[PDB]
Amino acid sequence: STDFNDKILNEPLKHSDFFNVKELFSVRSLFDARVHLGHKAGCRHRFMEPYIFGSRLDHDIIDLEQTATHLQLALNFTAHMAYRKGIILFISRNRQFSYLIENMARDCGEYAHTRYFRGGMLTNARLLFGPTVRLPDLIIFLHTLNNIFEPHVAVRDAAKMNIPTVGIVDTNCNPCLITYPVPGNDDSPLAVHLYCRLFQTAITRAKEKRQQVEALYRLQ
Amino acid sequence: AGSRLETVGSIFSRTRDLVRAGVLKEKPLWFDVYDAFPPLREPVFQRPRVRYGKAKAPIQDIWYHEDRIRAKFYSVYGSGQRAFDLFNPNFKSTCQRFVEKYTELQKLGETDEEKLFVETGKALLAEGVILRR
Amino acid sequence: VESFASMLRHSPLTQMGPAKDKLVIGRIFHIVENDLYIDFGGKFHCVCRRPEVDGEKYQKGTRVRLRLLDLELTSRFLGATTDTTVLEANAVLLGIQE
């Protein structure tokens, strides 16, 4: 099994971009999707200040040059986790996009939770699913705030369960506990559709690459 | 299972320490991926603070030179009766045409704001765009 | 290669300047009884009541003329450290875009 580990699981970690996620998007694409449009300056969260290019007539603008690097890292992590056959759980309480996120999760063979988050999904999983339930290996927040403009409880619960998190963080969100934050707009439908497209494509290509590499290893 | 002290360190530091100490028999699936490709900032908890005294947010207002021209335009000729189309990535308003002509007249001529304004208005009217004061 | 600064500078939304009392074209993308949800290219949509004059023409995909008042409706209230937002823009529905 040592050769299997070395050739399958350890090889992809030796390359800067093994799944070529850099060609899925560009700064111009994010601009066209309005990923740079943040909330007004009055709703700004302090920890989002380093990611803000400036304030255009009291409306924050998210620096897309930083968004490019952050999204690159997040998509690379997601692709690597999908290649490793890890469970990926999308979370979002924005009801305008619940159907889209559920469809996307079903399409890429991953899991979604767009509904009310009952207390203890992650911290009390053994009682609520069974003594042998397997928790997600990665959680992706398309919206990190619940409907009262406070952090989704799943962020803190995922930190407690030592589950890495990718997150889309707007100017009024707190990125302190998201492992791989991506500063960007999370309200306009174009941006959310772009995020769903990018993550679905990354996960799907990673799975196809895993099957291809395993088949090649078996043949040789 | 790992520690649940989410406010102490990060998930990476906690997992690494517990793996080193023998509490965790095996590293989790994500540990190697994180270690090879870490985030720009380690996700450590921090309590946001209210600012006081002279402490101010370092966010700057976004202004360009032509904004001045735009301001004058929107005060003299008013909002253009033509409507904005923000869906077009290359939409050109009457104010934007005025700004471009103003910049060209500035670069090919002298620098007197009022004369530039009237010359730009004359040139635009010659082009055939209505500009009611 | 165009940088983000150039994109922001030459963006139509940047060029528009202040949003108050500006005429824009929006597209209806959702209808709930007599409430029309309209996107005009901003961060948020605006929701308008169906006019009583020629109300049947207002359907999904319809182009409409709007007079913007606010790109986002926010306000700080007593005893709060952050603004409260309704996640909606304020606009006046004028008519159909012929």
């Binding site: 400036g54 | 700057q60 207002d61 202004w63 360009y64 030179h65 904004d67 301001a71 929107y74 | 600064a5």
Partner: peptide, 25 residues
Amino acid sequence: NEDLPISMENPYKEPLKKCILCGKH
């Protein structure tokens, strides 16, 4: 780069509102 924003006072700043008797004795 020339496209960066430049330090400036708000040119769209609306004049402060005045009472009906402002400036009158």
